[PDB]
Amino acid sequence: HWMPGEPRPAYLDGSAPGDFGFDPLGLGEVPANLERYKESELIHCRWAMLAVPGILVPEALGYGNWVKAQEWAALPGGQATYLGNPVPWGTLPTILAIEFLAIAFVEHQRSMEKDPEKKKYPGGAFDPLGYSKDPKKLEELKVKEIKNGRLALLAFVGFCVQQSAYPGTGPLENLATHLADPWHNNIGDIVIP
Amino acid sequence: SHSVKIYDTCIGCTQCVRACPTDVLEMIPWDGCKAKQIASAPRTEDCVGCKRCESACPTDFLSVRVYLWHETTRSMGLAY
């Protein structure tokens, strides 16, 4: 339970993976709306669980934080770089053309599926290593996946919020700053001036 | 001539026919109420439209209704 001593909603029986009876606003009363929300939550968790490795590793190697990598496109004629090496196809109009075309096909392909179970865990060709053979392990795996995704979403929220308070600073820079003098570099001096 | 209608919520207390300034309304026998009476409007061509009948109806909403309609020399009260 998300809070002991609180009654659970009737539609949250606790049988779904990663279900802890959390719905204070009652946004999932409609059976059709609840089924869609699980797919959206899984998509968000999967997308955010890939950004975290890509937001710290480039910074930890001294290539700059995650917001400096987008400044070149505002400049006229700016060219992209990777591992310190400029890419020949790093022009702005070329970058958008491949990005839109490549993902407009996969997302539309995902939309066309009609079986609700496959919209979340399609199986088949996306599971080459055969981790879905055991139904007993599958439930604990789904619980592990759901539990980590919300943590990654919270981590991304922290990443985004810390940037607003300290412009031009990276999350690892934030950790280093806090580690030096913990009792004066923290949330307190921001909440009250 | 104006239109006068009677509805079956009548209780037959004869209050409308007594307040008529002309001879328009009258009472006929009926079954459906304790008084065993109901009003009638056989002479609507003499109606002037002062709506005194509706001022005397005791029923919550009126069991007698007057709808103003095409005007004649009788319904305008002219004695030229």
């Binding site: 109009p93 407009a104 096909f105 539309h108 066309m112 | -």
Partner: protein, 91 residues
């Protein structure tokens, strides 16, 4: 300085996208949203003689039923995109 004739290749890309990717979505949306109707009857069958659908134009020998109206619409989208790209540059 980009050439105008080469930039108009966006028409081919838009036609390819319409014919090979978004065909089924558009067809099923059109099937779901039927013909406009008044009082439960379509415009033609209610009495309007000028509201008859043009069957002859709809018949095409394309294997998947690609029409000429679809060609016109996707080509218009491609031309709009190409001219937006051309106009935005050289500023």
């Amino acid at each position: 300085l980009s050439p105008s004739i080469v930039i108009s290749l966006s028409t081919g890309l838009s036609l390819f996208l319409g014919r090979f990717v978004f065909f089924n979505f558009q067809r099923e949306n059109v099937a779901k949203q039927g013909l406009p109707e008044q009082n439960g009857k379509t415009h033609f069958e209610a009495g309007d003689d000028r509201a008859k659908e043009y069957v002859s134009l709809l018949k095409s020998n394309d294997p998947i039923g690609f029409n000429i109206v679809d060609v016109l619409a996707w080509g218009s989208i491609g031309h709009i995109v190409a001219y937006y790209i051309l106009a935005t540059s050289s500023n």
